Ligand binder design. Structure first.
Ligand code: PRO
Ligand code: PRO
Ligand code: PRO
Ligand code: PRO
Ligand code: NA
Ligand code: NA
Ligand code: NA
Ligand code: NA
Lengths: 186, 186, 186, 186
């Protein structure tokens, strides 16, 4: 045939998935859109000995990603180990999406899909830092209050007193509104 | 040269534009997203004599599309004509998008981008047919009512009475509301 | 890499060796001329997974041919094994060529290079069948006569009487003449 | 398709005809075997604008060769204008082949197919130079005798006296033997 095993593999996935390739096709990017409408990219760098030797691949995830064990590799199987990981993280990105859409995020600026922390502005010179566990994203995040004692001490008290209200069936944002008894600036 | 230049041209275009190719790359589909967020596809069927022989191509437009092509042409050159045609039709698809989003369209069921006619229900017992000129999409379209006389007579009188109020700076739907003095079922 | 390396390998081999290829270059035929002026062809059927997956191949040999192949192999590497096998069989084809040129062969009609048997007419009323071992083509072959007893009895007696005179430094035809003390119809 | 119009043309002629190509396929050689068993090669150099612009091509003929007029070119049509020319010259190469096989040619050394002259040794310090007309190769060639008057003067006399014996239905060599009443050294 005129084309390499790589090209046959891409044709099988669908050319619509390939969103970048260098001239030698030694670097490619594949896209996947998740069930929630988010686009995710995986970059693969192919060596001379593909598919005997596994490609290097880079993703934007808040957890490690690792692919196959199989004797020879397979862009096909990898892309499917990428889709499964993406669906496994749906709850985490749902939580983060809502926070990013509805609140005033101080840090990070332009958060990648890998970012598990948000520093959210609550008011004049007060913010809350939350660290979300991407595998249990609707539980109580680690919270840290940044500001003067006159504002954050009472928040700490409400947090301890109202913690029983935390409902994992609700979003992180909703639970924060309920447990801290506050409104978030937009 | 042994290989065609097709692959080099796709690279220049950007692999993100290629959304389908058969195994021999004798048929490909390229996508363009217009300034208004709509996706449009062009299918090209190639022969080995490419580019000496123009590819066959198929688009979904409400007007004819015939590319200028010579042996100096490439995917990029037909793709650019395709984009220009798409932008020239922005006003037409803007008018149709609104009608399809806001009214009860009986025909076509799932209108292609080429469809210039709509049958719109004005109730369970009366409809209006419009035929829109894609080159002049906000002028008065050719229309007619279907339904019993007692239902259409009143519409017909309001139409001939308010026909002068038609404002090409307004959408087809808005003008119809103003002329017929009605509300469209959703 | 986008393209296979098949075309580069054919170039290394020399395009003069390629005597057939289908439109997709999934089937090719390579020719070798042996040291004795005989032409031999090998047909290879390739898949996109080449060279990770060994090609299928077909030759016209009187013994099995199984190439050593790994992902480091190329057309050149199987072609070289093919040439080595061809030269190893020079003595066999030298013996068969002489028989086919100088005697009246009844079977096969147009013998392929794989054919190790010949039925040779000793007249209009008697034949001898030989089966030649391609690995030991000048040893005494397995043979038998066909024909009426009065015609074969004399041949059979001369054979058992002169069987010791067989000289492996001589061709099969020459030895048969010396043992049977006869002349072969042309 | 993955391949250029050139590759499709070569596939149509048969890969067995292509006996050389450079890496970029900007230079190729095609072979033709004539009805008389002689091999002839045509070299073609392809430009960027093939097949709009005619390739350059080189042959080894004793007459000019020139190909098409057609609006666009065609390796196919050219190869067939090459085969026809080759068959047209069969008589000329038949005459030259016999001379080269049976006589002692002093010049040229290793004659190409284009060479219309032969200087043939007749004996100690005597030769004959013949110039054959490739379009009328069995007629009396232009003859010139190289040697001392005592040998060449009588040959000149025999040539004039016996010229009526020249028989265009016979080869140049045969006619020379008959008209000059001599034997040619081997
Ligand atoms: O009038 C037109 O142009 C459209 C094209 C498809 C059918 N009607
Ligand atoms: O607006 C309506 O009533 C129609 C009924 C079918 C779907 N929409
Ligand atoms: O004995 C052999 O090996 C040959 C092969 C083809 C049939 N007989
Ligand atoms: O030698 C012979 O007589 C056989 C007859 C058919 C062809 N050769
Ligand atoms: Na793509
Ligand atoms: Na709780
Ligand atoms: Na060839
Ligand atoms: Na004469």
């Amino acid at each position: 045939q005129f084309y390499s095993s790589l090209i046959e593999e891409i044709g099988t996935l669908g050319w619509d998935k390939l969103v970048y390739a260098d001239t030698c096709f030694s670097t490619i990017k594949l896209k996947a859109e998740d069930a929630s409408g988010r686009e995710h990219l995986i970059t693969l760098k192919l060596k001379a000995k593909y598919p005997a030797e596994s490609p290097d691949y880079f993703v934007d995830f808040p957890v490690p990603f690792c692919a196959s064990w199989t004797p020879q590799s397979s862009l096909i199987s990898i892309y499917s180990q990428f889709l499964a990981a993406i669906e496994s993280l749906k709850a985490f990105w749902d939580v983060m999406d809502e926070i990013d859409e509805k609140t005033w995020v101080l840090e990070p600026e332009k958060p990648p899909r890998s970012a598990t922390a948000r520093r959210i502005a609550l008011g004049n010179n007060v913010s809350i830092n939350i660290e979300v566990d991407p595998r249990h994203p609707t539980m109580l995040p680690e919270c840290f209050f940044l500001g003067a004692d006159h504002v954050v001490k009472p928040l700490g008290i409400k947090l301890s007193r109202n913690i029983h209200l935390w409902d994992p069936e609700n979003s992180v944002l909703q639970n924060l509104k309920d447990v801290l008894e506050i409104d978030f600036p937009a």
